[PDB]
Symmetry: C4
Subunit: 326 residues, 4 copies
């Protein structure tokens, strides 16, 4: 019964696992990092920048797309403002671009202006995607724009993933509570350790033949490959990209050291009724996006070389982990 | 045998678990936070302030009741003094009030004056409620005042809970060793990690159709919902409320920062023969009770929205957890 | 096979367990703390001070015996010097006294002078008691002095305990690696977490009807009751008693704060060929032995009151624990 | 299936285990520390210094060999430079010496000059030895020089070990990610906790009757004996030897304290395309190699005395561990 199964489940995070090295005949420089997210969207690297007001606006989306990745333009701005940012990305050599939409009544206006601006992928981005509001919005957006790649989230269970894909989503975004600036676990007591959330959701996605985005909690390149090997098609980054020059914030100095503001979309500052679910902090200035992406992808290339993985499909389907203690 | 089963049991604390998000068609603002503790006592929020000399006197009991909660007037004062505090709460618009009683010979005098003062709930509050002294006091108080709501504790086992409810208690208070200022675990080597203590005691309480109060160890709003989802009908708070303006202590300044004194009822200072079982410390001034209660209940509302819980009964009976490592 | 069973065993320390509260009809002040170590030796409290040059000489042995406990005069001094210390203890009202002996060739001379001085218990104290040298010394000492209570150690296994009791030891002392100043685990990679070491050794001792001393790793009163409840008849203390006025060292001041020197018997300073197995450090001045013993025994009394244990036999045979995470 | 077994494996590190003390009739001074690595190579102590530019050049290889150990001359220098270092070691009384070779095209030239210089053991040292490049190099080196002792690595699995021994390696070197200066786990998300890596690889090596070198992650003498007892024939040290006078770096002063530079062979500084897999740091000056080796071997002697191990073979085949928590 439900009473008896209350504590049956046990879950794993990035720090609980390591990839086991395997027979390899490939050098890190020769591995294939490309991923087919939908029949219309292919990325050259499995990295997506987060739809956050301290992470992705036009500058970040352009630089990400230039590296073979993707940017999610945040929705904490006017509808025409969001459309204008998408337009600049499209004007920068026809680069791919994504944009976040909600479930509020203004969504129909927002979705229309973004599609008119040339957006390639719409992201129904909510704190809790296993809801009637999200499922109905997935159906409406897919019915209205059947030629637009649709991401829906955030989820952390197989049942939620099944419901989003069945409602018409092309991609399901995974992550309830793992974020660096996230206080969801502390404030609401809810969450699923990210490695188990990815694995459970990817187990379901394999039945549908559709992709998942592993969103949140990635601290280093090692966590990227672990996220992909657990079942994620691509990863979403907030913290690792917030300190780059290309993020929306201004570079400020403090006691001789340069910093950039990084905040949760559920923080008081971002929300300006709901109690905060994110913090506002200062992160070290990391220089250009180009440098950070190269170091992170180099780490992924090393791990694929250790696992004998020629491409991401082989890494997802064959790579093995070991569990460990602290 | 007893020798062979010495280390069979394994227990969980708040930090070992998280609630799993589920299908939801309800917004945090629309969830129902009310709880029926007894046929005569209904709270609008599942929060009770602790019977401690640095937490609850008339001011705290009035503010708590005003928020839909309850206050437990501490017994570390004269019998007529305790009766006077209850009287002020009753004079403040007929608000609900509780008062702590012991097992000492002066209890008959104390219980009579509190009942005459209009007390709604008597709390037989001891460090160890699974005792002959407590069970006999439960029988006596219930026989003398059958119209008064009776809480008895503290316990951490199913057998203890069964014995207290069978002796005539309406509500059983759960918590042996989890408190913030508590040194019971360190000093006496006794205790049950609070999530397992709640679950084991609520498993028994379900058979009797009676309520349990999850007492101690709550550090944030996330721990409140975890305490309720593990089986608690309401939670008891010490640390989270000690820094509010409404607590009995005076606001003192230290190096430009404001603080309030918070101490265990088993500390040297509070006890003024038994060796101390609590510490005396300084806690950050948090301002008004009203602000702290709103932030804590907002966090509970978010978690119920993630779990799809419309009310606390559904959260207790259906919500699922996951276990995790450090 | 031995290869396949290399990592089969799993062990518990003090910090992994807590005692479960049980039905109680006894107040902490009324519990019985006495223990029958041998037909000739009964203690009023289950506490023995360690045979260490920074813990027990005549002053500590007198004060310990006065509290109902026992002191082990260390052997890092001349044979006649050790005999002189035992003599002072016996001259102080016929109080009980113990003295440490080794396995070296000078032991016959040392054992004779200590017995002539009126020693009640001889302690064959070695870093590794599961050895041919110790077993032969047990046989020799018991054959020579059949009327003297004989302790032999240190061990951490059932097979070792069985071998020491069968060789003629009356009491087996348990503890390989748990000490506060001990570097045995770090230096030699050997040890058994103390709760499992006590339990495994007490499981064997129950078959022989003989006592065990739980030696090392006790940081607070809570660890004392856990040590006894896991199967120990009495506990041995080093760290908790080193800072008392009665320990052999002189009280020294450092930046306005008083300290006492505490060192392992395997430290460079104590040993003055073997590489050190203990450190030399400064511990906080705790005042009189009388005060420390009262606080520690008060904590034990509280735990026995929570467990419903009237005496130590009931605590050893019936008390139950719960395991927990960090 | 591969999908279902993704998280089946669980692994142990040095800090998760302790050796269980056993029946002993041997003193630490009388234990035998010698090991037969190949029919041509016998060491008097089971210690090999690492092939790193901050650990082993001629000075370290001479001192190590003088203690009964072995040094691995690093390959981050000219072919004739490496040959010159080997020559100095051979000129110092015919002491044993080892030298590292890669899988690059210049290897044939390097291997020939080292063999001509009198090298006793060639070490095919790579970050990932379970590769086509390494296996082919093992075959080539063994075919060319059948009279030279050949080490191949690094590996962490039974299948990898089997493949290296079958290709013709005499000794397999174990260690993927455990190093002190190693960022492989963090950067590439790959690794096997070292105790399990040794055990799994030694399980396979027992079938072939060949030796394994436990490489990396040893912080103290206790970790050396644990590494050997888990199945390693000898251990390889980097961190523990980097601070000795005999290491290639120069002794530098910082705020009155002496330090030596210690860096990973995958650090930016050492590599001077691949992203770094090691850090560059300052380690405390430990004085002479002779002193450090004596303290480390003394600790190993103590542990063998506790386990009753007369020699390393008995320690590998019979010694038992216990698992524990943090
Ligand atoms: C204040 C908080 N803010 C955010 C903002 C962005 C987020 N982005 C991702 C995640 C995933 O942990 C959580 C987030 C929370 C938030 O929206 N809570 C929240 C909690 C429960 C429910 Cl049912 C809902 N529904 C969407 C109404 C919203
Ligand atoms: C000194 C200590 N003080 C307190 C005071 C308030 C407490 N309130 C709650 C809890 C729960 O950990 C413990 C508390 C200990 C205390 O009463 N110990 C204590 C220990 C064991 C037993 Cl059997 C008893 N019985 C009631 C006689 C009392
Ligand atoms: C240096 C060290 N010193 C001490 C001194 C007192 C101790 N007292 C207790 C314990 C228990 O961890 C260890 C101790 C180590 C020590 O004696 N090691 C040691 C290690 C292994 C063996 Cl087989 C032996 N045998 C007695 C010859 C001695
Ligand atoms: C940059 C790094 N540097 C080093 C250098 C020395 C090392 N020595 C030992 C270990 C074992 O963790 C790792 C090391 C990494 C390195 O070589 N990575 C690396 C990663 C994956 C593969 Cl498949 C390969 N193959 C040999 C081409 C190399
Ligand atoms: O305030 C917030 N609360 C909880 N999660 C958040 C919040 N803001 C953003 N997130 C999530 O955290 C991710 C960033 O994770 P990070 O890379 O670990 O910093 C975003 O992509 C969101 O899914
Ligand atoms: O001195 C004490 N020792 C042990 N527990 C205490 C003491 N004083 C109060 N408590 C308990 O700790 C609770 C407060 O827990 P907190 O909210 O974690 O601070 C109270 O409601 C009591 O049940
Ligand atoms: O140098 C040493 N190495 C290891 N154990 C030691 C040493 N000296 C004393 N011990 C043990 O540690 C105990 C004291 O433990 P403590 O009370 O945790 O400080 C003594 O009774 C001895 O059994
Ligand atoms: O940069 C590096 N990355 C990873 N492992 C390294 C690196 N450099 C050396 N190692 C390994 O780490 C070992 C030294 O380990 P340590 O004794 O724990 O410092 C060497 O013998 C190598 O196997």
């Amino acid at each position: 019964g439900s009473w008896e199964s209350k504590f049956a489940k046990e879950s794993l995070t990035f720090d609980d696992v390591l990839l086991i090295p395997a027979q390899s005949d490939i050098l890190p420089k020769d591995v294939d990092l490309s991923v087919q997210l939908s029949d219309k969207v292919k990325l050259n690297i499995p990295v997506i920048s987060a739809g956050m007001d301290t992470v992705t606006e036009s500058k970040m989306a352009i630089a990400m797309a230039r590296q073979g990745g993707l940017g999610v333009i945040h929705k904490n701005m006017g509808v025409e403002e969001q459309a204008d940012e998408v337009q600049k990305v499209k004007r920068s050599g026809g680069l791919l671009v994504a944009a976040a939409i909600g479930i509020s009544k203004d969504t129909d206006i927002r979705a229309q202006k973004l599609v008119e601006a040339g957006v390639d992928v719409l992201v129904i981005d909510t704190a809790h995607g296993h809801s009637k509001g999200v499922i109905d919005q997935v159906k409406h957006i897919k019915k209205t724009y059947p030629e637009i790649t649709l991401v829906a989230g955030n989820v952390a269970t197989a049942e939620a993933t099944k419901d989003l894909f069945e409602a018409g989503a092309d991609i399901v975004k995974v992550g309830i509570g793992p974020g660096s600036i996230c206080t969801t676990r502390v404030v609401a007591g809810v969450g699923v350790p990210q490695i188990t959330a990815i694995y459970d959701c990817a187990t379901e996605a394999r039945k549908h033949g559709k992709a998942i985005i592993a969103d949140g909690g990635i601290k280093f390149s090692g966590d990227i490959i672990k996220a992909l090997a657990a079942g994620g098609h691509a990863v979403m980054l907030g913290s690792l990209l917030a300190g780059t020059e290309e993020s929306p914030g201004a570079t400020e100095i403090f006691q001789g050291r340069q910093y950039k503001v990084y905040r949760g979309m559920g923080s008081l500052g971002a929300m300006e009724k709901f109690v905060p679910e994110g913090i506002e902090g200062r992160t070290a200035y990391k220089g250009a996006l180009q440098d950070t992406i190269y170091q992170l992808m180099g780490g992924v290339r090393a791990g694929m070389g250790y696992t004998g993985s020629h491409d991401l499909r082989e890494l997802r389907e064959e790579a093995q982990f070991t569990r460990m203690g602290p």
